[PDB]
From Swiss-Prot, chain A:
Stretches assigned to the VWFA domain: 11-187
Protein name, entry field: von Willebrand factor
Top-level taxon: Eukaryota
Portion of the parent chain present: 1267 to 1465 of 2813
Disulfide partners: 6-192
Species of the source: Homo sapiens
Curated annotation (Swiss-Prot), chain B:
Annotated ranges, domain LRRCT: 204-264
Residues of the full protein shown: 18 to 281 of 652
Residues in LRRNT domain copies: 1-30
Organism of origin: Homo sapiens
Name of this protein: Glycocalicin
Gene: GP1BA
Disulphide connectivity of cysteines: 3-16, 208-247, 210-263
LRR repeats: 31-51, 55-76, 77-98, 100-120, 124-145, 148-169, 172-193
Glycosylation sites: 20, 158
C-alpha cells in the first residue's frame, strides 16, 4: 500500500474500454494495470472503495462500491474481466450509467469521488449527444473525471470536453498499454492528492 | 467484545454482521450513525429499540429472515433502511416512524399485496426497491406522498396490471425497473411528458393490439432510454436495447415496430 494513499478517503471507479481498438492481449495489459493500481491503494469500506466496470455498447459491472469483499477477492474479479472487444465502445452510455446508477446520491461527502475513465476508442456521433451534459452533471455532483487515452484512436474530442469544464479534471494520453506500467506511479500521485486525509 | 466499533471521520460505524445475533446487543454506543446487522437470526424486530441512538441515519437488516418488523417509536434522522432478502409477508408502515427516510430497500421478500397509503408520510423518500416479491396489483396513489422519488424498482414480480397515475407527481424519476413481470399493456398517458433516462420494460408479455399504440409512440421517441438488465453470476450488465420490448404474439417482434393495423 502507498505511503501517500493510506490515510486517504476516496471512491474510485474503473471504466474499462471494451472496443476492438485494443486486442485481447492489449486488454490483458489494461487489466494488469488496474490490478497493480489497486495493490498500492488501501482497499477498504472506511478508506478506499473500488468499482470495476467494463464498458462497450453498454456497461458490465463486475465490482460495486458497496461490495463487502476482501481486497484479494476484488483483485481476482478485476483480473478475470472477460474480453468483449465490441465494435463500439460508447463512452456516453458508461457515463450516463456512472451519473445515475453509481453516483445517484452523496453517501461519502467526506471523501473524494473519482471516475477513472479508460478510453482508447471513439463512439459514433449519434451517441455523443448528451456527453457534455453528463460531464457537467458529474461536476455538480462533485466528481473528478479523469480521461485515460490509450493509442491514436482515443476520442481526443471527448478528452478536451472534460478537461475544459473543471480544473481538477486532468487527462492521461498514452500511446500504448505498455505506458500504463510507466505512469502507474504518477496517476496515483494525482488520484490520492485529490482525496482528503483522516485525523 | 463481539461487535466492531470504528471511528471514521466524525461519525461512528458499528459492524455486527454474521454473529448469530438473535436480538440487539447490549452496551452499544449512543453516538452511532451507521449500524450493520447483516445476516443474523432475527425472528422479529422493533425500531423502538434503536431510539436511544439519535445519531443513527443508516440501518441494515438484510438477510435476517425477518418475518415481522414492528414500527414503534420514532427515528427523526434515519434516512436509509435495508430489509432485503427476508420473510416479510406484509409491508410495515414507515410513514409515522421514519420521516427523514430517503432510501428504502425491501427487495426479494414475499409481499403478496400493498395496503392503501403504504408510503404516506415519506415526503423525503427518493428510492423504493420492491424487486423479487409477488406484487400482482398496486394501490391507487401509491407514490403520491413521495414526489421526490428518483428510483422505483418493481422488477421480478407478478404484476399483470398497472395504475395509470403511478408516475404522477414524479419530476425527479430517472430509473424505472419493470422487467420480469406479467404485464400485457401500458395505460394511456402513463409516462406523461417527463423525460425518463432509464426504463426497463423487457421480459414482459406485451399484448400488441390497439391499446398498445401509446406505448409504441413512447418507445419511438424514447428508444435511447430503454435499457436491459441482464445478470451472469455476480456480473450485472445494463445495455440499451429498445428491441427488447417484444410482443407476446410469438414472433419475437419488437413492440415499437408493431404496425397499427385496423386501429384508429
Amino acid at each position: 500500500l502507498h505511503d501517500f494513499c493510506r490515510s486517504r478517503l476516496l471512491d474510485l471507479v474503473f471504466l474499462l474500454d471494451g472496443s476492438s481498438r485494443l486486442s485481447e492481449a492489449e486488454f490483458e495489459v489494461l487489466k494488469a494495470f488496474v490490478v497493480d493500481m489497486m495493490e498500492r491503494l488501501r482497499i477498504s469500506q472506511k478508506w478506499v472503495r473500488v468499482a470495476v466496470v467494463e464498458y462497450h455498447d453498454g456497461s458490465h459491472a463486475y465490482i460495486g462500491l458497496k461490495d463487502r469483499k476482501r481486497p484479494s477477492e476484488l483483485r481476482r474479479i478485476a483480473s478475470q474481466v472477460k474480453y468483449a472487444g465490441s465494435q463500439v465502445a460508447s463512452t456516453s452510455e458508461v457515463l450516463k450509467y456512472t451519473l445515475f446508477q453509481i453516483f445517484s446520491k452523496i453517501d461519502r461527502p467526506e471523501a473524494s469521488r473519482i471516475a477513472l475513465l479508460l478510453m482508447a476508442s471513439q463512439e459514433p456521433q449519434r451517441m455523443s449527444r448528451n456527453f457534455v451534459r453528463y460531464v457537467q452533471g458529474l461536476k455538480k455532483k462533485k466528481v473528478i473525471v479523469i480521461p485515460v487515452g490509450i493509442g491514436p484512436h482515443a476520442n481526443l474530442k471527448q478528452i478536451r470536453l472534460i478537461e475544459k469544464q473543471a480544473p481538477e479534471n486532468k487527462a492521461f494520453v498514452l500511446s500504448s498499454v505498455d505506458e500504463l506500467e510507466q505512469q502507474r506511479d504518477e496517476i496515483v500521485s494525482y488520484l490520492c492528492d485529490l482525496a482528503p486525509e483522516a485525523p | 467484545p463481539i461487535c466492531e466499533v470504528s471511528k471514521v471521520a466524525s461519525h461512528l460505524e458499528v459492524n455486527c454482521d454474521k454473529r448469530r445475533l438473535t436480538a440487539l446487543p447490549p452496551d452499544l454506543p449512543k453516538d452511532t450513525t451507521i449500524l450493520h446487522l447483516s445476516e443474523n437470526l432475527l425472528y422479529t424486530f422493533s425500531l423502538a429499540t434503536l431510539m436511544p441512538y439519535t445519531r443513527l441515519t443508516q440501518l441494515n437488516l438484510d438477510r435476517c429472515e425477518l418475518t415481522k418488523l414492528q414500527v414503534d417509536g420514532t427515528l427523526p434522522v434515519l434516512g436509509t433502511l435495508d430489509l432485503s432478502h427476508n420473510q416479510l409477508q406484509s409491508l410495515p408502515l414507515l410513514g409515522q416512524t421514519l420521516p427523514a427516510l430517503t432510501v428504502l430497500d425491501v427487495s426479494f421478500n414475499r409481499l403478496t399485496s400493498l395496503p392503501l397509503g403504504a408510503l404516506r408520510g415519506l415526503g423525503e423518500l427518493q428510492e423504493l426497491y420492491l424487486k423479487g416479491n409477488e406484487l400482482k396489483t398496486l394501490p391507487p396513489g401509491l407514490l403520491t406522498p413521495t414526489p421526490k422519488l428518483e428510483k422505483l424498482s418493481l422488477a421480478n414480480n407478478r404484476l399483470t396490471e398497472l395504475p395509470a397515475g403511478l408516475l404522477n407527481g414524479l419530476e425527479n424519476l430517472d430509473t424505472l425497473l419493470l422487467q420480469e413481470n406479467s404485464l400485457y399493456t401500458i395505460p394511456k398517458g402513463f409516462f406523461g411528458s417527463h423525460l425518463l433516462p432509464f426504463a426497463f420494460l423487457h421480459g414482459n408479455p406485451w399484448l400488441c393490439n390497439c391499446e398498445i399504440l401509446y406505448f409504441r409512440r413512447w418507445l419511438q421517441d424514447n428508444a435511447e432510454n430503454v435499457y436491459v438488465w441482464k445478470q451472469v453470476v455476480d456480473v450485472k450488465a445494463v445495455t440499451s436495447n429498445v428491441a427488447s420490448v417484444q410482443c407476446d404474439n410469438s414472433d419475437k417482434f419488437p413492440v415499437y415496430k408493431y404496425p397499427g393495423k385496423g386501429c384508429p
